[PDB]
Amino acid sequence: TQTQTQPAGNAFQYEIRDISLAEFGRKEINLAEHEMPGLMQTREKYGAEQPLKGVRLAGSLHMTIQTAVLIETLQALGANVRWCSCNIFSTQDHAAAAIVAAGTPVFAWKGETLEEYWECTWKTLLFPDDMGPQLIVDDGGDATLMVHRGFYAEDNPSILDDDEGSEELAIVNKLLKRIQKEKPGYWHKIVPELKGVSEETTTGVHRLYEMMKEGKLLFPALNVNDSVTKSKFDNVYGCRHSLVDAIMRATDVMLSGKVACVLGYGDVGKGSAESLKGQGARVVVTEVDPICALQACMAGYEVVRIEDVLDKAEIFVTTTGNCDIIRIEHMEKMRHNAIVCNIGHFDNEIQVKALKEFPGIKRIEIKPQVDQFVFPDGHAIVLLAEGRLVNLGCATGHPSFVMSNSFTNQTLAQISLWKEKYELGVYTLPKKLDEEVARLHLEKLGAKLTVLTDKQAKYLGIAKDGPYKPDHYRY
Amino acid sequence: TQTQTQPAGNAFQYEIRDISLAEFGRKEINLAEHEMPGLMQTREKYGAEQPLKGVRLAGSLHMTIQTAVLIETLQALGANVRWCSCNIFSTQDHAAAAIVAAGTPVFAWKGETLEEYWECTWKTLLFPDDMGPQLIVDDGGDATLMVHRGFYAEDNPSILDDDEGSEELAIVNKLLKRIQKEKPGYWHKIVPELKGVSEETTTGVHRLYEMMKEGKLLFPALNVNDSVTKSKFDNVYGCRHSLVDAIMRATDVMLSGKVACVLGYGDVGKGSAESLKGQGARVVVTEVDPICALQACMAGYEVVRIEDVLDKAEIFVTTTGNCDIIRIEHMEKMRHNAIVCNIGHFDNEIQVKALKEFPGIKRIEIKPQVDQFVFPDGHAIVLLAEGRLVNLGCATGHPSFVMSNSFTNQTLAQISLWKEKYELGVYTLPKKLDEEVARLHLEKLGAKLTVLTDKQAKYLGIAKDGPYKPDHYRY
Ligand SMILES: NC(=O)c1ccc[n+]([C@@H]2O[C@H](COP(=O)([O-])OP(=O)(O)OC[C@H]3O[C@@H](n4cnc5c(N)ncnc54)[C@H](O)[C@@H]3O)[C@@H](O)[C@H]2O)c1
Ligand SMILES: NC(=O)c1ccc[n+]([C@@H]2O[C@H](COP(=O)([O-])OP(=O)(O)OC[C@H]3O[C@@H](n4cnc5c(N)ncnc54)[C@H](O)[C@@H]3O)[C@@H](O)[C@H]2O)c1
Ligand SMILES: Nc1ncnc2c1ncn2[C@@H]1O[C@H](CO)[C@@H](O)[C@H]1O
Ligand SMILES: Nc1ncnc2c1ncn2[C@@H]1O[C@H](CO)[C@@H](O)[C@H]1O
Ligand SMILES: [K+]
Ligand SMILES: [K+]
């Protein structure tokens, strides 16, 4: 994909698809602001204080219209922002253009190659005068991964020669090796000034705990995914909206009456099942966790192993955050034109590589991000977004109103990481702030909260203004 | 209510309504055993070990057919059991009779007075030879309350002279005064031998933390309510079944098209709203917690203050565990024959006392536990179960299959309290045991659980046999 970079001598750097989309992007941002009252009210509340004044802030998170409102909230609070997407297909090019037109470095376009993706991550982290970010907003942990690998590779450069059998890790290694030649010691220079990362998603938080357990985490992390107002809203209701949206845009297939296999029944699987059930699909669920499996049964879904429904299901959606959920031997047995997609993580929930390399397979692009793979025996499957996040790759991701929850959490997390003294570890926002995120969205919905009386507050032993629930409450 | 006590010289004591109901109770217990695979498999698993051999075990928990299977599970593991109900209307007299016919002390019948209720609690706690329980199963904390008040009043008997403006506390104080006269030092004798309590319900757990906060808890407690397989199944799906069941049995009123006000949207409120929505009611929800309120909005419910639906709703259900949810000034404004009921706690969610004492009000019993209160202006309301737990008071409570979750947790909690050396505090069962509770119920449902491969287990950093989720996971 041919891109536009900043003119020579421009005040700031960028790389996007098309700056002429800016006016359209700005119109949709204006509409989205009205749909994001929590984010806009937080922008107003902290505006005078300027809590992020001058902070070098790098974000690696889907460059959508919703993220544009987050970027401009962080800027309204004083931050000096650079941004890239965290997925090669998730950028909305009009959002990127509108943000560049406002003067902000963005390195993101829809349809990046993997090489381009990591080059964009580097451009985002590299601030002028060979500086780095003082705070990072991350979704999936790729920016955090690059910082850590760059730092540890400066101590032991041989790790840049072990790709672990991963073509993508080879890309990262080659980039880091080039940076060692161009900017020796860069990562050791910038890590002491990087005061924290706020991480958006379940897989990114898992990566943070891998690092913290090995004693390798280099700076504090705020787990935004596990705010109640994120995990229980974005992951559930966001996917309820955006999964079926993407399937409809990509394929225009009727869901009603079809068997749809949802693999996983965590937060994303729960919302995904509801997304399809609302259209009259008969949803069947796979799970490894017996509690989640029992929840699916109590919702009226049949709990199956994938092999049990290869002759029945015509839609498969992976939601696990795990590897090798839909294997090549499964796809060999699927019904003709069965739709195969992933809403969980990266691209390894489906064995996309083994599918592409299957002997004698023929690939036909129906349209961008919709690929029919025809097997020699004559049956085909339809893969969406090359097995990457389908809601963002084939539609527009979650709608603004729910992203206002997630991004109010991100804003408060950035403020907290900057103002508070966190030790090395992974933290969550206090429950009273989590409650505030929800509270800010009630007025637009016409929802009126009841206020505890003095007698009731004493009876329950809680304050009228919260927090209302014990620390361990599950909602 | 005329009761039957054991014959003079009987091997054991009891007080129930009618022993002739035993054969009917036993038939329903036989059916319920098939619906409770978690309990029945737990019997087989721990049968040889006899982990509760000889343990004096007192239960204060709704004397239902489901509790009969729990009692006989505890006995099948060796326990020496005595039982009473924790609510004056919740006993199923046939269940009580079937358990007495099997040789077990039960002090419970449907329609006790408050004085009789506390006399039954005392008969349950008092073991032969002036002994007490070594373990307690409690639901709502009444037995735990009596033990603590008995112990502390032996140090300061003037505690028994302060009724605190409560007729029911006056009943407890009068009984404790008699026990001080008949058996001085009884509570100081039995407390050192009482190894723990396992508490079934949200309100009882709240009481445990209040005692912990005051430094007054006298023995360890296992919080059964907050097992995942209890709170997210019993409190939710149990009420989804048993709320509408009770409303239908009590009133035979069509829910479809009516506005039904559910006050509270925690676990019980969530299940209650689903109970009514399934019949085409238009559910409106009240809440003090903005997170729970936002969840209700995302489910398509209008969130209101009760005052905005007094001219609309014809059903009101309190689910809060809090006091003074439905006030007399609300009931004065309700639509004619509006149904008013409580599925939360005790009898103070609705201002039943103020209703009974309202000037000029007329009470007409339609049938047991269904009372029409006719106001002087001609409008009436229909109060269910005198404002006590409506599912247990006007129907049969939760169905056996979901109680198998709760009662497998109770069984495991009793085993744990007996075998492990807990300190003074409130504890929950380990996640792997919580998962086991769910796993035991999958076969009857036909659910097929997937097993992680070695590669997937390594990828996620978990064991193939669990636990599958972080400690703080909310499901
Ligand atoms: N695309 C989006 O917009 C979006 C939104 C939120 C989160 N996410 C991503 O979605 C993924 C899931 O997130 P979550 O919050 O639902 O996590 P979760 O832990 O709540 O749920 C994942 C579930 O997958 C199950 N699972 C794991 N391996 C399995 C297997 N082999 N077969 C069947 N089930 C299996 C687990 O038991 C678990 O219940 C993560 O990668 C997360 O980052 C994506
Ligand atoms: N009848 C049954 O079979 C049964 C089953 C389970 C639990 N319970 C009982 O039900 C009650 C609720 O339990 P839970 O697990 O749902 O507790 P919970 O804490 O999950 O929910 C209670 C909800 O009530 C809300 N609330 C409190 N005061 C309010 C007010 N004035 N107006 C509106 N909302 C208000 C709280 O914000 C909370 O979300 C407890 O008393 C519990 O012991 C009964
Ligand atoms: N419209 C969107 N804009 C930005 N991020 C999104 C959008 N929809 C979903 N996401 C995020 O993508 C993450 C997965 O990488 C989810 O945790 C979710 O918060
Ligand atoms: N059928 C039943 N038998 C015994 N206890 C029940 C039944 N239905 C509901 N309960 C319990 O009553 C408690 C409320 O006192 C709930 O926590 C729930 O576990
Ligand atoms: K969107
Ligand atoms: K029942």
- Dihedrals φ, ψ of A215, to 5°? 70, 30
- Are the CB atoms for B150 and B179 separated by under 8 Å? yes
- Are the CB atoms for B197 and B135 separated by under 8 Å? yes
**How crowded is residue A183: how many other Cβ atoms within 10 Å of its Cβ?**
14
Centroid of ligand 6 to alpha carbon of A429 (angstroms): 41
Q: Is B154 annotated to bind ligand?
A: no
Pick the CATH number of A237-397 from 3.30.50.10, 3.30.450.20, 3.40.50.720, 3.30.479.30: 3.40.50.720
Q: Take residue A209 and report the two structure tokens written for it.
A: 């705990």
The residue assigned the tokens 């998170």 is A61
CB atoms A474 and B439 under 8 Å: no
CB atoms A322 and B466 under 8 Å: no
Residues 6 or more apart in contact with residue B44 via CB below 8 angstroms: none
Q: Which of A291, A303, A351, A408 to mutate to test the interface with B (most CBs of B within 10 A)?
A: A291
Paired with B290 in beta bridges are none
The resolution in Å comes to 1.4
Contact residues on chain B for A226, CB-CB shorter than 8 A: 472
Instruction: Give the strands of the sheet with A15-16, arranged side by side.
Output: A4-5, A15-16, A106-107, A80-84, A56-60, A135-138, A196-199, A221-223, A426-427
For residue B231, which of B188, B184, B269 has the smallest C-alpha distance?
Answer: B269
**Within its chain, how far is the Cα of A251 from the centroid?**
23
The residue assigned the tokens 């097993």 is B451
* Ligand 2 atom with least separation from CA of B267: 16
| DSSP string for residues in B180-203 | HHHSTTHHHHHGGG--EEEE-SHH
Per the annotation, the verdict on A342 as an active-site residue is no
- Are the CB atoms for A165 and A103 separated by under 8 Å? no
- Are the CB atoms for A381 and A331 separated by under 8 Å? yes
The residue assigned the tokens 């009043």 is B153
Q: Take residue A286 and report the two structure tokens written for it.
A: 């796979």
Query: Does the beta carbon of B235 lie inside 6 Å of ligand 2?
Result: yes
Alpha-carbon gap, residue B447 to A344, rounded angstroms: 23
Q: Tell me how many degrees the CA angle A211-A217-A220 measures, rounded to the nearest 5.
A: 125
Q: Take residue B353 and report the two structure tokens written for it.
A: 């006392």
| Way it was determined | X-ray
Centroid of ligand 2 to alpha carbon of B46 (angstroms): 34
Alpha-carbon gap, residue A264 to A216, rounded angstroms: 30
- At A223 the three-state DSSP class reads strand
The residue assigned the tokens 């995120």 is A437
Alpha-carbon gap, residue B22 to A171, rounded angstroms: 75
Interhelix angle B65-76/B37-46, rounded to 10 degrees, is 10
Q: Quote the DSSP letter at residue A431.
A: H
Q: Is the dihedral of CA B194, B196, B202, B205 positive or negative?
A: positive
Q: Is B202 annotated to bind ligand?
A: yes
- Are the CB atoms for A426 and A221 separated by under 8 Å? yes
Alpha-carbon gap, residue A198 to B269, rounded angstroms: 33
Distances A190 to A51, A129, B309 between C-alpha atoms, Å: 21, 12, 59
The residue assigned the tokens 């008995």 is B150
For residue B261, which of B300, B297, B310 has the smallest C-alpha distance?
Answer: B310
User: Do the two domains B1-236+398-475 and B237-397 of this chain adopt the same fold?
Assistant: yes
For residue B270, which of B296, B306, B294, B244 has the smallest C-alpha distance?
Answer: B296
Centroid of ligand 4 to alpha carbon of B69 (angstroms): 13
CB atoms A447 and B302 under 8 Å: yes
Alpha-carbon gap, residue B379 to B241, rounded angstroms: 30
Distances B68 to A86, B132, B264 between C-alpha atoms, Å: 56, 21, 31
Domain ranges of chain A: 1-236+398-475, 237-397
State which amino acid sits at residue B173: N
Q: Which architecture, in CATH terms, is B1-236+398-475?
A: 3-Layer(aba) Sandwich (3.40)
- At A190 the three-state DSSP class reads helix
| DSSP string for residues in A15-78 | EES-GGGHHHHHHHHHHHHHT-HHHHHHHHHHHTT-TTTT-EEEEES--SHHHHHHHHHHHHTT
Contact residues on chain A for B210, CB-CB shorter than 8 A: 461
Q: Tell me how many degrees the CA angle B118-B410-B348 measures, rounded to the nearest 5.
A: 40
Secondary structure, 3-state, B72-117: HHHHHCCCEEEEECCCCCCCCHHHHHHHHHCCCCEECCCCCCHHHH
